[PDB]
Amino acid sequence: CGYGKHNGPEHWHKDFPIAKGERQSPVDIDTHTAKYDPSLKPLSVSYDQATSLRILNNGCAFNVEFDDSQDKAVLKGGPLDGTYRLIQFHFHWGSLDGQGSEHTVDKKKYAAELHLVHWNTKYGDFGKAVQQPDGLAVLGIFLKVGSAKPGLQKVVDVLDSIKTKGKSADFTNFDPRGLLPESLDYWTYPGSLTTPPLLECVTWIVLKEPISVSSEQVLKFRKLNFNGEGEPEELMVDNWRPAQPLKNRQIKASF
Ligand SMILES: [Zn+2]
């Protein structure tokens, strides 16, 4: 995941030619071209039994990891067929409050974007699922800066213990329901992972309503480091891929 001046997103296609593929993410969501789809079934976010395990700085972002060895936290419904298990969430964010999201809405960039990553249980494990066109479902939630998000603060306050690449910390009993907005109204389209290997295995479900976080919460994201301990400091900021061509896809609205 290079995001620097010399290995950023514009360079990824040399190692990962699918970077110029037909169903790459993120995309700009043009709210006046998306169409309401009455065939969509209700979206079901079932996180009551979620079991968080750990938080890891992987040099790209930080991942909050879940126990996915049973259907404890699943996403169903919407555009999805079957059951998708929560494996981790992470964020992308900017150096400045006016940038950081991956998806855009009518070209608007948000300060950050939350990705709750789920895999289709029919494929047995995550690594098999990413090889399938319907392998993953990613729930995307925009972050704007305004009032503090109480449900995010436990995350913010462990970041000091995972400052550098390769550090992890115990992160049990975190409830990801605290990161959801009130409304589950969404846009959906077929896409890809937004970091290498950029595999075209994702059904994207992007919520229309952003959550608000405070300036102080996002400033703590920006104190993380892309580098490992003992290396020259490179602040973990602007870890987002810009919008990719929509090509032969239709974005559908649930509302
Ligand atoms: Zn992501």
From Swiss-Prot:
Changing residue 58 to T: Reduced activity. One of its GO terms (biological process) is angiotensin-activated signaling pathway. Changing residue 63 to L: Reduced activity. Changing residue 115 to E: Strongly reduced activity. Gene3D superfamilies: Alpha carbonic anhydrase. Its cofactor is Zn(2+); Co(2+). It is found in: Cytoplasm; Cell membrane. Changing residue 117 to A/G/I/L/S: Reduced CO(2) hydrase and p-nitrophenyl acetate esterase activities. Zn(2+) binds at residues 90, 92, 115. Changing residue 58 to H: Reduced proton transfer. Changing residue 58 to A: Reduced activity. SUPFAM superfamilies: Carbonic anhydrase. Keywords: Acetylation, Cell membrane, Cytoplasm, Disease variant, Lyase, Membrane, Metal-binding, Osteopetrosis, Phosphoprotein, Zinc. Zinc. Can also use cobalt(II) with lower efficiency, but not copper(II), nickel(II) and manganese(II). GO terms for molecular function: arylesterase activity; carbonate dehydratase activity; cyanamide hydratase activity; zinc ion binding. The record marks 3, 58, 63 as: Fine-tunes the proton-transfer properties of H-64. Changing residue 194 to A/C/H/P: Strongly reduced activity. Changing residue 102 to D: Normal CO(2) hydrase activity. Changing residue 197 to A: Normal CO(2) hydrase activity, but impaired stability. Optimum pH is 6-8. Changing residue 194 to D/E: Strongly reduced activity, but enhanced zinc affinity. Belongs to the alpha-carbonic anhydrase family. Target of drugs used in treatments against glaucoma disorder and breast cancer. This is Carbonic anhydrase 2. It comes from Homo sapiens (Human). The gene is CA2.
